[PDB]
Symmetry: D3
Subunit: 250 residues, 6 copies
């Protein structure tokens, strides 16, 4: 089963990691912690398909659901990741209902979508009964990260073939004319974020958000977000090294 969908079905949110650093060793190590999922960022990172493919395997072995935040909402790219064992997709710049339908089209076989059939890794995980359960094995979230997406939230949330939305708050702040600060307190940004969550839940959809700290993630879980990521590997590692150096150098 998809571990995130299991969380949801059991009435709990999912907490996920966020990787911008390529490689399998930290991917497995973080998957073995109390993360339900680990997202590999293929957008704001140097991680290409060749490097993502073994990382999916490593996260699955470590016992978290492997997710990818893609560089673009492109059906063929998403299909190839699904067939490589990405079991969650977070697609950037879903700004309109039509773009959300384009995301949905990639996530489902005919007749619900147009996903091409050749499920190399999912058929190894799920066996020959995969086709009947395929749609449920994948979680799909549309990114909300622009003014336009915010304006079109209800129309995006009307698309049956997506699970919900994923807020990209640094990009949303920037597009609203504010600083792209992680875990921002900017009142209009905080209000927009709450509005997206409320609309998603009203529409019977799931809502996620990207976080830069455990404390902000605790607040988002308390507010009812269904999928909360915290925090990027590179940021956590940089901050840890700075502290080690300060401690060493007195």
């Amino acid at each position: 089963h998809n571990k995130v969908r299991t969380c949801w079905n059991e009435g709990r949110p999912a907490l996920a990691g966020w990787l911008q650093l390529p490689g399998t060793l930290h991917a497995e190590a973080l998957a073995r912690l109390d993360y339900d999922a680990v997202v590999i960022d293929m957008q704001h990172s140097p991680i290409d398909f060749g490097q993502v493919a073994p990382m999916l395997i490593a996260i699955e072995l470590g016992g978290a659901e492997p997710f990818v935040r893609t560089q673009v909402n492109d059906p063929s790219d998403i299909m190839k990741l699904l067939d490589a064992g990405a079991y969650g997709i977070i697609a950037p710049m879903v700004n309109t209902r039509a773009e959300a339908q384009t995301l949905a089209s990639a996530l489902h076989y005919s007749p619900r979508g147009l996903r091409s059939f050749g499920p190399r890794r999912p058929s190894l995980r799920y066996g020959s009964g995969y086709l009947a359960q395929a749609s449920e094995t994948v979680v799909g979230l549309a990114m909300i990260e622009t003014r336009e997406a915010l304006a079109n939230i209800d129309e995006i949330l009307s698309v049956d073939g997506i699970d919900g939305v994923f807020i990209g708050p640094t990009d949303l702040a920037l597009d609203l004319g504010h600083a792209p600060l992680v875990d921002t307190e900017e009142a209009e940004v905080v209000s927009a974020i709450a509005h997206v969550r409320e609309r998603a839940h009203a529409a019977g959809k799931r809502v996620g958000i990207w976080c830069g700290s455990g404390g902000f993630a605790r607040v988002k879980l308390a507010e009812g977000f269904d999928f909360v990521t915290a925090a990027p590997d590179l940021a956590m590692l940089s901050a840890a090294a700075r502290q080690v150096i300060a401690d060493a150098r007195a």
Copy 2:
């Protein structure tokens, strides 16, 4: 146009270095840009092979730390290839005897001081036409002390002119002495052995380094007068940071 670690030493100061077990260039550059004098890439207790180390050396140099490698083995050809790829410090495992220390030294210097083969693809680009005349000074070489035998042979190891000194691996020394392989071990016999190595190194006019798993332990080693202190592995730092973020996120 100088080895940053050697510049620290020429000012009578220690060098503090990072320690990478995760392949890739992005964290390598980001950590090199911090207040580390060097960043060591571990090619022993990691999945980092030559193909992955090569671009990491470039990234560390661009970030402004001296690129170092802890090799999988004290093998002259492996070390030479790393030098020609722009490793400017070498930490070689399991140097247990004077002869093994001479083997390390042989790789680090052109004839007549050593037997290093000539083809310095990346050092020639960094140092330019002045390279060959200063080549030995551009590289730091440290012999690992991680066994009972190495401890018994410390003075003979330190007598080898062509190495700068020694690098203590405390976890492996504890395990070889019959203790648990603890990170930042303070096992009494291990502690005594380490103090002996540092005393002998400085008596010989050589440098002594040590691996640390924490900023706190590194601070103590710096206070004890170690010349080269590493802290802490990228993977360990990242794992611990993620565990803490998760605990904070899931807190009541």
Copy 3:
């Protein structure tokens, strides 16, 4: 010369291999068998450009024509493969005449198409007279794998700049509401396949098909298909291992 086009010019079909496993060693080994071509699948596989590039070289050295089935009908992706020495292209989801024209546009230099000039590997194979012969050095096939493509077959076959069509029968079955079974006996799927072949031949075009077995491939060659692939490396290897294990374990 392109070995597939030589087959056609000499009045014989081409039989091709089908690789979903990255790497050069099996690619060369299979190219040295009595295959006229070897197709590298960049869609239902983990094979990215970095891994396809040496495989093209290895197939050419082994003495088969290197082909690629791309992840998408994208002109720039196809051009880069041509310049890396892919000498056949099979493009997915060609559903309309306009999509088939998009495929043709990538396969020909101006004035016939819009292919960008910088033929790194073809200029090494063919020399400075490459430009005059370039179009003939490449075989281009549009995939027919949807209901819509079937409905638009005559309009797709009207596009001068493609050699013909390549049936993807598992996807076609699925899109027709049937199980995506390899080498299917499903009557409507079998009928649709024969209809595509007959239309292609009537239009003076070539037709290919993907097969999962030697026996099915024998039948397709007998029915007159011009390009028959059999069978995917991973499927053949899995089946061989299962048999070895059954034999060993008694």
Copy 4:
């Protein structure tokens, strides 16, 4: 600072290298010569993202500005390169004002463009004040390499968010019905090239051109081109080897 923009601000053109061969060693070595920039060609080469990423680092270390000529004018591909430390972009097949606006959209954060925020490598080079200076850190040039682009030059040059244009003269010759000869003397091609330069300068924009020889590059610098590339690594290396062999074999 971007070394090319420094040249321009100081009233001098930039001379750049041109790499079609993957790898970091020649990239650094050439960057250390008296090149202001080095362009990595991701179009007419086997260089994919995985191979370009370390090459950007190596060129920057060698002391030239790292540029990329992309396979396609795609915003998400361009963004990922920017975040990997490409500080110049040359985008193919900019044939219309709308296509030039698509290029501009990728090069600037909101409100000027729609660039997604997560500047992994530029934030290491430029620090936390990167956002305010981001646009100036990147040079963007639209390729002019078709009849249509030539016809639409004034409309392309009207787009505020691009620095100017980059002529691809082999493709331009081919699209005008001539041989795709490097450094051509063909009168209509030479005239078209001069016309693009004059229009660019009249519009207060920059103009670049691709060259195959030092002698042709000297003439283009004398004619006033702002960005001149000379010559591709593979071509220079092949010619050098041919000469070594002729000398050795007498």
Copy 5:
């Protein structure tokens, strides 16, 4: 939390293993999910280097077979790096003497039983906090017997405590004895030599493995009481399958 091969042995049963010469993770996982107890990655007669083996180990483990490696050489540092990357079985070539068998054993065990260096990046993730206390049991080590000399020295090789036993390479043994290097050779002198090795192994209370090129030969070796049987190389299986598909496709 157990080595699948060792569990077979603790039940008095042989293990059957796959054999990979093709790099990549997809077939590695797919074959591991079959009724193989282990999958051996051949790093000797293949183009598989460390960078390619590392993700394959992960894929085999996920598929549910024990990941094994046949190394290019009996070199302790190479073997240690593979162990720390999650190779849980090692087959080392050209073990011709007791001293070479001791060299293999030295790599597989921490002090005091061996000299394995401490940094178990992947085994610590698989086994958790219980790892170090069981580390030796988590790994299987087999010395290859592939020469006349190894055959003469079989009893001394089998006397080395820290190896589980031996792995016969019949094609190389045939070639070294002066015969054609046939796959699944049945050359009479070779057959006799192999039976001698297996008898001596079991007399010593050790395990004996053998490489096979076919299911049929593997079935015989299992019947003869071999403890570890490999069958058959991915490349050979794939090539033969493709030849048969082509013959079927081109048949009248």
Copy 6:
């Protein structure tokens, strides 16, 4: 179905070879298609590791030159893996003694002439069923002479039957003799030493090769009767060509 270098020699002619320090297949194929008999991939003074050499061998073969490798070290297992990946010529560094020359020879020949392990993944594809009967002739092996010791031992090195001859590294020989490591050195003592090696090689009925940094120096070495001449490294040729293009572009 023949080694192009050996065919040159069987016609009483020298072979001219390229020399690659840059990884990648595109220039490798392009240079192989020129009038080079062989292309040597340098795995010593380069960043080319096994994973990168493997596809380069394929590319050189397709381009129509014989693929050769100058290894990082004279190690039999490394050499065997390269042979099985389709390296058809081996140039091994630091062959200083007859015993080291025997070590090189051991890797290049199956039993009984050598100890090469059997698994010829790529040579079996190139040569087909006729491979094993001709295997030794398909490979050329040259021992590098680059030290004072090697020069003193030249006759004993040349007495080893299983090597085709020697390959002189003039820059490293100059450095080991106490001179500057100049490319195409003409240092008088170095020049004398090189002439001695070539005379001894031909006296022994063996082949003698030499590394060159220029077409002009290669022409002289061909005139002096060397059997295998390399010229010139890809990186050096490319750098010099780019410097000249820049000087032409920036000229008044």
